[PDB]
Symmetry: C2
Subunit: 139 residues, 2 copies
């Protein structure tokens, strides 16, 4: 397995859960996290075996609860699109009635602004700490 | 107990019930765009369901996604649980094509709003109910 170049360029790799690599989108919105099952040439969720899907949803829900516990979002959005980047990746985004894309989807509706260095470092450290409380996480 | 949210009822045609999720067809002329709605109250997010319910959900989601792949051969399938305006947990399953009006961006908020042709709607609904019936536990609803 190898993380797709586009996901690597757009994110900070927070660490690895048993199945999915966990990424943080660098854009100043969210937090916007992405789970990437470490399985080669994967296009659709249903292409994973039923058992891989089970581990995926467990990790997905653990990360979603993490977003709920730390950022008290008005709503959480989860999505698997992959129209351009072929490598299966699932977005997990904290949404607010005040964000630039509300109430529509974040995809294709952001300002493109990047999170400040000090802010990025602080968020990454907190996220890694909270992810470490999830079984199997490795930074 | 559980009751389909009025907005989803208005925007869709109920195809039937899988053991956990009600299966709906968005009336808009794009997709096919289906929506799965776990028939359990108090749900706004997937992680709100119990572990057992989540497992049943992902199995139903994949069975429906496989149905979309096998019957419409889309260029890509998109799945999403958004619900910024409709609190009731519902998961979008959409067949995407390089030629659809929203490609390569998301469908949400990027359609023309036009509803599928009447004759086309009846044909698609009937086809979907028949194909969904091949999935374990699916019970068609024609009301
Ligand atoms: Na946000
Ligand atoms: Na982010
Ligand atoms: Na498993
Ligand atoms: Na989840
Ligand atoms: Na995706
Ligand atoms: Na993807
Ligand atoms: Na993947
Ligand atoms: Na979104
Ligand atoms: Na489409
Ligand atoms: Na549709
Ligand atoms: Na969730
Ligand atoms: Na699926
Ligand atoms: Na939704
Ligand atoms: Na929605
Ligand atoms: Na929802
Ligand atoms: Na629901
Ligand atoms: Na094309
Ligand atoms: Na979409
Ligand atoms: Na349209």
């Amino acid at each position: 397995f190898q993380l797709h170049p586009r996901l690597q360029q757009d994110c900070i790799v927070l660490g690895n859960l048993p199945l999915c690599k966990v990424l943080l989108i660098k854009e100043d919105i969210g937090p916007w996290l992405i789970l990437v099952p470490r399985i080669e040439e994967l296009k659709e969720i249903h292409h994973m075996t039923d058992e891989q899907q089970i581990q995926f949803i467990k990790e997905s829900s653990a990360v979603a609860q993490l977003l709920e516990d730390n950022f008290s979002p008005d709503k959480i959005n989860i999505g698997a699109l992959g129209n351009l980047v072929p490598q299966l990746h699932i977005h997990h985004i904290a949404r607010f009635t005040t964000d630039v894309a509300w109430p529509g989807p974040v995809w294709g509706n952001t300002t493109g602004v990047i999170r400040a260095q000090s802010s990025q470092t602080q968020l990454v450290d907190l996220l890694r700490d909270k992810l470490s409380n999830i079984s199997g996480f490795k930074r």
